[PDB]
Amino acid sequence: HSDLTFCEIILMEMESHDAAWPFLEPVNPRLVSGYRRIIKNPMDFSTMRHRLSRGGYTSSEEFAADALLVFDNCQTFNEDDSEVGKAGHIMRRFFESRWEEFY
């Protein structure tokens, strides 16, 4: 629906963010040993983009839950001072700041 256009925009802003590079596609289990074993519910921005593109979100709250899941997964798997771990903390605040502009 057009009701979620503002979420398409937030997602775009996230995809184009300097700290977005870890989160653009699903983590590859061939490259990150045991990732999908440790992280039960992987999530990434392309998966979110596809769900928006097909109209698969029933609410903006569902979209925000997926965003937070990206960052919760990152914090679960990565150290705070690692490059991916640093990026996840940057991106969480970015998402939160944009969400707070509507809520």
Ligand SMILES: CC(=O)c1c(C)[nH]c(-c2csc(CN3C(=O)CNC3=O)n2)c1C
């Ligand atoms: C373990 C973890 O939580 C990771 C996440 C969420 N993301 C990445 C990661 C590393 S690299 C990358 C994107 N990427 C390529 O796949 C090729 N060049 C490039 O920048 N994502 C990791 C390791």
